[PDB]
Amino acid sequence: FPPLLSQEDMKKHKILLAYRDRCAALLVPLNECRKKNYYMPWACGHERHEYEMCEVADFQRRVKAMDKLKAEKIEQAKAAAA
Amino acid sequence: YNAISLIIILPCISWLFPLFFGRQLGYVFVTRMTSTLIIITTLITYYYFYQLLGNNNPINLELFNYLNIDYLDINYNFEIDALTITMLLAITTISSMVHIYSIGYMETDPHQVRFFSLLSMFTFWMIILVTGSNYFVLFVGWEFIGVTSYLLISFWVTRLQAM
């Protein structure tokens, strides 16, 4: 996983409100790569594959957290009746 | 050469000149005139969209003051944002293709001078609607496209259902 970018580096590279997390370190070369070409879809695919794989890892820890939420609801539902 | 201004000025030429000079130029000329002038407007805005992918740096142009009153100013301001260039390339493409299309579809109809005129003012007030840079210029284009839609749906004034 990439390190979290600094708050000042977010202010420098002008990353949008919804893109700033522990994966946005892989966003700032991508967009820059995207600015070198003219947003053409055949080009600059390696870096967007990198950013997508990082986001898949974020998605897997999101789903594992939601899985952890579902067990404690069942456990409190059984413990409140008894 | 100014890209932000020729998006505005060229469909104004393509509308004012079919009305003021339609009797003097004739249908056979005003067909190809209104056609080619919307064609070159459409080409200029593709080239501007190609420029805008290089740097996301929009261009605005400033005009005189509409109204100055106490806490409120309204200026004529025209700014091609990325949203604006998105809508703009689509409406100029559909417009220019419908101009070329209606050259041949209307060749038996009498009044196609007024028809190609009104098509061009519809495109023009659409342009001003998209590229305006306050809520006022949005309103000006917003009303006049409804005015054009009156003048366009009722093109056969003889037909009762069209009126």
Binding site: - | D109, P110, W156, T158, R159, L160
Partner: protein, 106 residues
């Protein structure tokens, strides 16, 4: 209400023109339509031999009400005609000289 006569003939011919035209716009296929129209014809062939006025008027307004139930939203009109879309596009202006109203200027 009346047996064999020209006015009863005019009524039944009008009702048959209706029932054909009415069936025409319900049905998209040719084959199912011309089958159906032959059936409709057979319904008119089974009748038209009725002697009394009572059962005649009974079946008459009963099939008028049966004709009213199967009405269609837009009848197929030819476009140059008053239901159509080509109706009154360029009606040619009648040739008129100019009437004048002022002694002094036009």
């Amino acid at each position: 209400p009346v047996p064999f006569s020209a006015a009863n003939k005019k009524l039944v011919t009008s009702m048959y023109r209706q029932s054909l035209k009415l069936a025409r716009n319900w049905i998209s296929n040719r084959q199912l339509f011309r089958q159906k129209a032959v059936e409709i014809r057979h319904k008119f062939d089974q009748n038209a031999q009725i002697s009394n006025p009572r059962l005649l008027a009974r079946t008459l307004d009963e099939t008028r009400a049966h004709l009213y139930e199967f009405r269609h939203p837009d009848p197929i009109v030819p476009p140059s005609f008053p239901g159509g879309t080509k109706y009154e596009r360029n009606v040619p202006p009648r040739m008129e000289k100019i009437m004048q109203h002022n002694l002094y200027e036009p």
